[PDB]
């Protein structure tokens, strides 16, 4: 069948500066009417996709002139002349030459760059209420930091943990451009009551050295 290849998978841009994304088709999309059947769509966090460009180079209704599309045949490019915070999200190209059959590109993640922000670290022990039910979850929170890369290591009585924690990271805050991340260490009630000192150790670019939070059971 037909294949649509987008590049890059993701990029981070400083506000005010341009961005360029590339969609390449395995087969030509030019039809006898001399128009190229290639569209560009955007999907913002928590929303359904919405059309940006139709028929290769034509801006859709309501789209400002900062967005422009170019290219022909088998190679197309979407360019944003000046990136704003509101442009963060996922961008997909789509072929319609086989209408009613369609094929979407893999998509490209558009993130917004800002100054480095150190995370605010908090630690929450398990509640007695959860302990009743035989389980104990310890949560380590990294709040409003940038960039997103950060390593969280769990240590129980100074013993490094592995395989018993899971992390979840928010999408970039489309207003302050920061991230938040949670690391959850899950233990059984007995195991939790076998040890005393619990700590999460955070390594991030914005910190001059790793920060350790802890408590005693």
């Amino acid at each position: 069948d037909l294949l649509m290849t987008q590049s890059p998978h993701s990029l981070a841009v400083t506000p005010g500066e341009p961005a360029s994304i590339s969609c390449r088709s395995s087969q030509s999309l030019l039809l006898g009417n001399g128009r190229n059947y290639l569209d560009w769509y955007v999907q913002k966090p928590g929303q359904s996709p919405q059309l940006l460009i139709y028929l290769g180079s034509n801006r859709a209704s309501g789209v400002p002139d900062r967005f422009s599309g170019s290219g022909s045949g088998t190679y197309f490019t979407l360019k944003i002349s000046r990136v704003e915070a509101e442009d963060v999200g996922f961008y997909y190209c789509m072929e319609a030459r086989q209408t009613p059959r369609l094929t979407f590109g893999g998509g490209t993640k558009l993130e917004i760059r800002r100054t480095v922000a150190a995370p605010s670290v908090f630690i929450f022990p398990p509640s007695d209420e959860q302990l009743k039910s035989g389980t104990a979850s310890v949560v380590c929170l990294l709040n409003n930091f940038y960039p997103r890369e950060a390593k969280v290591q769990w240590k129980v009585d100074n013993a490094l943990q592995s395989g018993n924690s899971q992390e979840s990271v928010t999408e970039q805050d489309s207003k302050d451009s920061t991230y938040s991340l949670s690391s959850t260490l899950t233990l059984s009630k007995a195991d939790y009551e076998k040890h005393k000192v619990y700590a999460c150790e955070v390594t991030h670019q914005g910190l001059s050295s790793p920060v350790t939070k802890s408590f005693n059971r």
């Binding site: 009417n33 059947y37 059309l51 859709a60 789509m94 319609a96 209408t99």
Partner: peptide
């Protein structure tokens, strides 16, 4: 009718 009128997936 896409050969004459196509406005994208609205």
């Amino acid at each position: 009718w896409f050969y004459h009128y196509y406005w994208g997936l609205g």
